[model samples]
Target: RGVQMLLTTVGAFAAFSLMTIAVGTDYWLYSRGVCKEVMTHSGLWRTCCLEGNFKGLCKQIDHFAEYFLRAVRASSIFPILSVILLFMGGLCIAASEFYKTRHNIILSAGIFFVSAGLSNIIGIIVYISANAGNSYSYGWSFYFGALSFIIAEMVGVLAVHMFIDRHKQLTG
Candidate 1:
């Protein structure tokens, strides 16, 4: 059980770390003016058919990456939302521990889960929006904003479940 818990926790951290790296790479490419092609091509993809611009397709991908990075840097929406969700979710979970009210903990956990789910939903929406010719910034707003919030919620729910179960005695 201990090993399982440790591995799960570590894996989660690693995933987050990889995401961070991806964000950083995107940002760096944007800074270097490499993402302009990506952005332009992505824009073309949205407006015109792929048959028109068969070559330089890769440029569009680069543009998209740049757009996403710029959005992240400018709005900081995702990071902010993530922080808020994590902060609030953590507080709720901690409050449950202090209060020792199972109901309170469960309620907190539910809130966290909903928030986490919202975060993911937001990202999908933003991605679709960006692909549809919306500003790259909007894409980031949806992407990170939703992702951070929901992940925190999910963590809260999982944490509460695990902790609460330990408090219960198995009669069977």
Candidate 2:
């Protein structure tokens, strides 16, 4: 039970971290020069301007930049929702521990983590698909997003397994 709690906590942390990175990065997409007057760079929350051209020329992102703007929006939305779910799951685990009941909250937490992890993966896939034919190279933020997805999935699965095993031991 202790181990299961620990795993769930760690998974929640991982998901939260991923959410931060995804929301904070402004380099989800990058191209050398989309046009003579501007460069291409975008993130979940905002767009980037050309170097040395700090006209503060950040543009607002809409569903019109590319065909997959909607897809990018999904990628952003899912992880945010996942963070909320994982946080709630963590609270449930803490509550169960405090109540000293035989109830297992880790199961629910695991489910949330799994969902969040899958959402992260889907977002990355959609982002990649959107840039499939572009001359853009993925930026560091993109790698961070990928790493977050992998960590979230691994931690979530581990938490689920640990919780199930612990529950079985306690019940039998």
Candidate 3:
């Protein structure tokens, strides 16, 4: 019980870390310009398009157009939404153990973790789909987000296993 509880807590924390980094990046849709070596990247907040091959100019866009960050509703909201669900699951899971109320709370946390993981994946799919015609490869942010998803799901699996085993002790 102790080991499983710690594992789930740490797993959720680690997932949170990964998700935050990936979410904060402007490289979610990274690509380079063909003008001899210009770099460009974009995210929910802003889009940076570097110019001037000799001097390396970059745009300081404070905000983006409506479509780039706003229109893809799932891609826009689902990811950050996952983190909220993530920390909440972690909260409930840890709180249950704190009070040692492993019966109902644990199973609910398991479901929450699954929902967060699935929501994270759905956002990933929508983001990938945004790039019409397979125009470019995904950026580092996507990989990290995927890593978070994997970790989140693992935590859920651990949660369900622990929930069953933890509660079974009470029956006998």
Candidate 4:
């Protein structure tokens, strides 16, 4: 139980860092191109372009101007959603630990972490899959995004495992 939580806390904080760093930066896709032509890059919210270092161009890629953009926008909702829920999950875990009687807080935090992790995962999935499949490459932020959710889900899994283990001894 102690060790599970050791990794759980460590992993969850790691997850939080990745989540923030991933969504907070651009370059979910780094679309390189011929030097003579402009290369484009996209993050969740912006379009950035460069041409042989002549110009570093970027702008907010807002609005549902096209179906692809619309999908990206729609999916973008979840990562931000994840942070708040992750915070909630963290609070739940802390509160749960403070009281022996409120073991249910473990269950609650597990659910919160699951929700946060899944929400982050879904948004990244859409962004990755909704692409036109050009020279665009998934960026570092995407990797971070992925690992964050992965760690968080692991935390959730451990929490539930601990919960069921405790309950088994109590009731079954």
> TM-score winner among the candidates?
4
lDDT of 1 at 100: 65
lDDT minimum window of 10 residues, candidate 2:
31-40
lDDT of candidate 4 over 1-172, digit per residue (tens):
3887777677677877788888888778878543225777778777677555745667776544367656656557788888877787777766666777657888887898899987987777667656643555678888988888888899899889878877788774
Please give the distance, in angstroms, between residue 62's alpha carbon in candidate 4 and its true position after superposition: 4.1
Per-candidate Cα lDDT values, in order, are 0.42, 0.65, 0.75, 0.75
Q: What lDDT score goes with residue 126 in model 2?
A: 63
Query: What is the per-residue lDDT of model 3 for residues 23-97, given as tens digits with 9 covering 90 to 100?
Result: 887667766643224566666454566555433434433322546544664247888888898888888876884
TM agreement with the true structure for every prediction: 0.40, 0.75, 0.80, 0.81
Choose 3 or 4, whichever is better by TM-score: 4
lDDT of 3 at 53: 49
Rank list by TM-score: 4, 3, 2, 1
Write candidate 2's Cα lDDT for 28-76 as tens digits. 7776543224666777666767564653456566544664566556456
- Score candidate 4 by TM-score against the native: 0.81
The clash count for each model shown is 11, 0, 0, 0
Q: Between which residue pairs do clashes occur in model 2? A: none
